Amino acid sequence: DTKEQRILRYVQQNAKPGDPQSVLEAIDTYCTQKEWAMNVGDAKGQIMDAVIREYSPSLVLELGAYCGYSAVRMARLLQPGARLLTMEMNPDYAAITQQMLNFAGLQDKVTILNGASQDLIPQLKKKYDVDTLDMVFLDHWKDRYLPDTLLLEKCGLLRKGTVLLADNVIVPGTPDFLAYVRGSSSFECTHYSSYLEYMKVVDGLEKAIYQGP
Template sequence: MVSPAIALAFIPFVVSLLIRYRHYFLLFYRAVLVRWLRDYLTGITKEERAFQYIMTHAIPGDPLHILETFDQWSYHCEYLCNLGPQKAKILERLIYEKAPLTVLELGTYCGYATILMAQSLPLGARLYSVEMNPCKAAVAEKVIRLAGFDDDTVELIIGSSEEVIPLLKEKHGLFQADFVFMDHWKRCYLRDLQLLEAHDLLPKGATILADNIICPGAPHFLQYVKACGKYKWRIHRTSLEYFRGIRDGMAQITYTGLP
């Protein structure tokens, strides 16, 4: 048995861990434990619960109000790994600055970033969004249409990015993407960037914005971008969506077409 003296000696250490990593414990509680409990009690996914909230509280046809309602849900009800308001400002500013006519989004999730980009696009632009999970894609489809964007503006493609990217030209008519937003599995960032290169889908000057490059991180992607000589890059320092105490960042890279 552990003596009381030894047990007491560990208390300051445990308390210090709890204080230092309190944001991560809270994230685990909100993102995992609460979700498991409510999934069990309601029989539907948290994304479907969020959509029910959107239907009840958001104004149809008002993209900004729908995004604000998503934020309210994520702050006060259940955690969703949407883009969140802090990162949304970076993405929105880049869309306005670059004014891309063709946008490729990898990882639709619930359609938060999709709506943000769609309402910022210039007239005549088209957004192609890829989501591999059919259940999440079904929620995103309803949210995107609720915001007022039809298939002429936003085409939702269901499938894994590895399978979809090689077919973008032939099957979906996307010959080159002026702007790419990556917010899917972080381990796929490097693979998919190289797929975009291999299939000549990046024109010179194309912008790629990759989310969550610090938390949970995409080290191989960043290493490649910095070392290959094909890109100019910068890091936007942010916090994790809806958690100001957890550091994160977005990588903005520009394709130079070299070497």
């Protein structure tokens, strides 16, 4: 089997069904004690939680679900009726994510879209009935943060106040995205310094609030 299958099995055998917090703790324990994996982790996850609670978004888009760790983290804090759309282009990872959400009991709040951001973002309005997004969590290929931000704008998916929250802006880094949003009058940016998941290595999240064209 794969590392992702091992993470899922570990959750299934060490967390409580329908208890998202137990799911997060099981993933973090596995990834600390057994095998590192690119989940956002608890350090940056706590900052994510604070952001989600501040904004109480009704409709969130995630780019790059992986195993569903961040999807569980966000979805467990959403208000009744609020929704997460999470994109994962790797079909094996998309299946892990679905099963993770199912175990956590969050499947009614989340729709896992198996495809690439460049193909799916232009379909969001017509195919997934989206008007505008309240928040976007960027966690996919780091060289896609900037083009997909620009694509979301082109497609009319951002409104005044839409919160972009970007993982890994330090490691592996997203220098073009950071330079762009920090220099643009269309974004109000805040950096949240933290640590790479499961490691004593500095990383951070960037929040970039869209201000309109």
